[PDB]
Design an enzyme around this catalytic site. Structure first.
Site, PDB file in Angstrom:
ATOM      1  N   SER A  63     -44.414 -19.056 -18.101  1.00 18.37           N
ATOM      2  CA  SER A  63     -43.186 -19.740 -17.712  1.00 18.37           C
ATOM      3  C   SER A  63     -42.105 -18.675 -17.507  1.00 18.37           C
ATOM      4  CB  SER A  63     -42.758 -20.704 -18.831  1.00 18.37           C
ATOM      5  OG  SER A  63     -41.364 -21.048 -18.722  1.00 18.37           O
ATOM      6  N   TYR A  79     -41.652 -23.239 -27.968  1.00 24.39           N
ATOM      7  CA  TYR A  79     -42.166 -23.113 -26.600  1.00 24.39           C
ATOM      8  C   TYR A  79     -41.886 -21.708 -26.048  1.00 24.39           C
ATOM      9  CZ  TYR A  79     -42.757 -24.234 -21.569  1.00 24.39           C
ATOM     10  OH  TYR A  79     -43.191 -24.298 -20.261  1.00 24.39           O
TER      11      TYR A  79
END
Lengths: 253, 252, 252, 253
Positions: C128, C141
């Site tokens: 990401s 995350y």
């Protein structure tokens, strides 16, 4: 053949890299216009000019636009080297490397961007280097100019999205005549010392070999293509793992 | 007392940041040789253009003649134009690169052999968060600050262990350059300027903008033996701006 | 026609992203083995948990006994909860690290020696932009996506040249996770959601968020011989997000 | 002087690095609390606990605050290494390294953060690694966990500014008894082989030597200090230039 009807301009077009980029782009259907210092393929046109000379750049870009009516892709690939640390680099050589490698790219992009804006889509690929992230010894002007080129990249990508994407390709050592010359400068000519030295640089890349100019050209084509339509301002390394490797040996439990 | 008998050269020494650096160093006992376009508490001032090889050479030889050392060079001379790449005039593009990159080349070029000859140096390039990411309409500037990081990494690698070379990458700092940028966006209207600044402040995790002396402390740490195993590094002084992804999130 | 006869495993296989990678690889001729908790003309599907070693071992060994090869592994199983660090319950933090990082360790652990024995492989981790910068309230995350880059780099370096290992780092992409995220901030309100999506899109230089197929093209390129000198790399597919500094600048 | 009346917690407190962080923070005036698995009275208190055991973490943080009323500084420095590539790392070893190296830091931060928000200020320093950016061979769990630590670092910084600054220190090879062990594992004991190997590692860093634990501690102390008041979410290499170095030899022109 997805580059059908598209026009590409590629600088340092008689380089190992440049020639492979020209071949890859023609193979995918583009018309390629090549720019270099030589007269030296399957180019639709060649311009023998100095990318640091503004009048020359402007005339080449305008003749291309006049003849083909469009420019979709620019590949800034013109670049020179001096193997000197900073304080041993004479002023004219310093200015000249920064001029060729940084201002040459700016100039090409400057004249090419308006047409890409006019037309609605464009793709600018800057050929930078692993020396855009880390430094070898004896490469002050080169390392600095390749770092610059990523700034040039991220700026264009930020100012011209979404119509123009701009990205950098960061190769490690690529087999080219320059690579041979550098080996020869370092080790000279006793039996196969030149070849062993090129093989040794290969061994420092995690891949255990150096790269082929067509492996760079495949990455350029992908960035030029609609396939990479959400990638811009990115600096993709093609370096066989070099930049992710720390050269500290390690036992093996 | 930490820099007693040490000689520091700092360029752009009338700057928000240059001036603050010049002061920290003086406070910590350095003999400071200030360099700028202008006419301060320093031991020497050269009013010179860092792009003038002759003037640089002369200022570095005089300093060396007079103190017989240069411990510290802070490259801080910088200009900013506001244009996207294709709207930047060529002479302006060429000048920004010349000042921001070649001026550093030149100071380092004359300074490095002195430091090698004498034993030790610490070089600090004042680069920017724009060495990593771009603002709009700052093509020449962004290019030149990315370039400085390369000059930094190159010098570090060729000249270790005797010379340490590092980059300090500030975020928005309260300086005349920044105030000016705000008016060019917001008018000379006092009140709108503070609103603009406070908005930039709120882009930074810290929620305010940096002070020039917070940058100067980081330059001081890098010039110091305290950072003796740091070289080739880029230290961000950006109140967290670069580690911030500007996409909102449920607070839940 | 490029992946004819090659075998790909893709985890998180009914993800927005997972699903598009699945179709893209099928459309370039691969035999695709889907992995997810769920149930697209894949050649096989495993409904398993990537954090369950037994189930992972089972899926990988059936695959290689069936096809005699695994050419391509795409790690894409990835969960998220919103919480800053000190408010994240221990079990949830452990769960996110487990799925996001160890799920990838486990798939790679069984797949690697298969690729090594047979001659060749490409492993693509879906990380990401939060592998480089943080959003608010995404502690687990963000830490888990940084970890995946380290997993990528290690694998790249220990197993070249026979295995290439690379990471794709998407910006905001139009997927179920992302629609859900918007609802969690804004509500179920249909065009309040799409306002939030538009606001994110506007944060990206491109002016819109990505499409899952834009991610899958990048994964296809990395699974492919065209990217044969690419390894240990992180490819951002972020519409320029990471290269943008969110601070306004004057015009002209 | 600067840390007078301040309190710091440092984990892995009987490691080379931890030991030198403790000594440095005491020199600058702090009261220092050590956490390790082991049994140094520079420290004003020591907790023999496991950072992966939540109840121990909680109890130690709680006893520290009741004793001192404050925790100004946390240094996450607990870490374990295994020398294996991913597929040769057994599952229990993988999970245990991620657990200590990532989960241990999460836990300490988790309990320290509300103490820091209550008193209104905190500085958190995560001891990470050059293995946070690049990789050695045979270090899969370790490289993964050290990359993870940077993300933990950026998240805390993003969520807890301005009151809590959170930064990472990324050391190269530091002289520690672990470096001796790794050398020993790698070459064995013929003559001064072990010392030569530590020397070879130093030669790989542009500084030409490895680091001293105190040079890491100086950077931790600067990061805990108000001198670095505008630094947060930064990852500072203390690696003698290692990460800026490309290992490809060059000629001298």
């Amino acid at each position: 053949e997805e580059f059908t009807d598209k026009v590409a301009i590629v600088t340092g077009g008689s380089s190992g890299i440049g020639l492979a980029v020209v071949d890859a782009l023609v193979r995918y259907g583009a018309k390629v216009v090549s720019v270099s210092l030589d007269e030296k393929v399957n180019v639709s046109d060649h311009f023998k000019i100095d990318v640091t000379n503004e009048e020359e750049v402007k005339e080449a870009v305008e003749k291309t636009t006049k003849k083909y009516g469009r420019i979709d892709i620019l590949v800034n690939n013109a670049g020179i080297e001096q193997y000197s640390p900073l304080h041993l680099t004479p002023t004219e050589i310093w200015r000249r490397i920064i001029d060729v490698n940084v201002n040459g790219s700016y100039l090409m992009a400057k004249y090419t961007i308006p047409v890409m804006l006019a037309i609605g889509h464009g793709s600018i690929i800057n050929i930078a280097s692993v020396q855009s992230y880390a430094a070898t010894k004896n490469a002050a002007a080169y390392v600095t100019s390749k770092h610059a080129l990523l700034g040039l990249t991220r700026s264009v990508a930020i100012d011209y999205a979404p119509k123009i994407r701009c990205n950098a390709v960061c190769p490690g050592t690529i087999m080219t005549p320059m690579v041979i010359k550098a080996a020869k400068m370092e080790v000279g000519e006793d039996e196969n010392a030149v070849e062993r030295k090129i093989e040794e640089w290969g061994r420092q890349h995690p891949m255990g070999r150096i790269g082929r100019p067509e492996e760079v050209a495949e990455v350029v084509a992908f960035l030029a293509s609609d396939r990479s339509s959400f990638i811009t301002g990115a600096c993709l390394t093609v370096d066989g793992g070099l930049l992710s490797k720390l050269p500290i040996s390690t036992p093996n439990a």
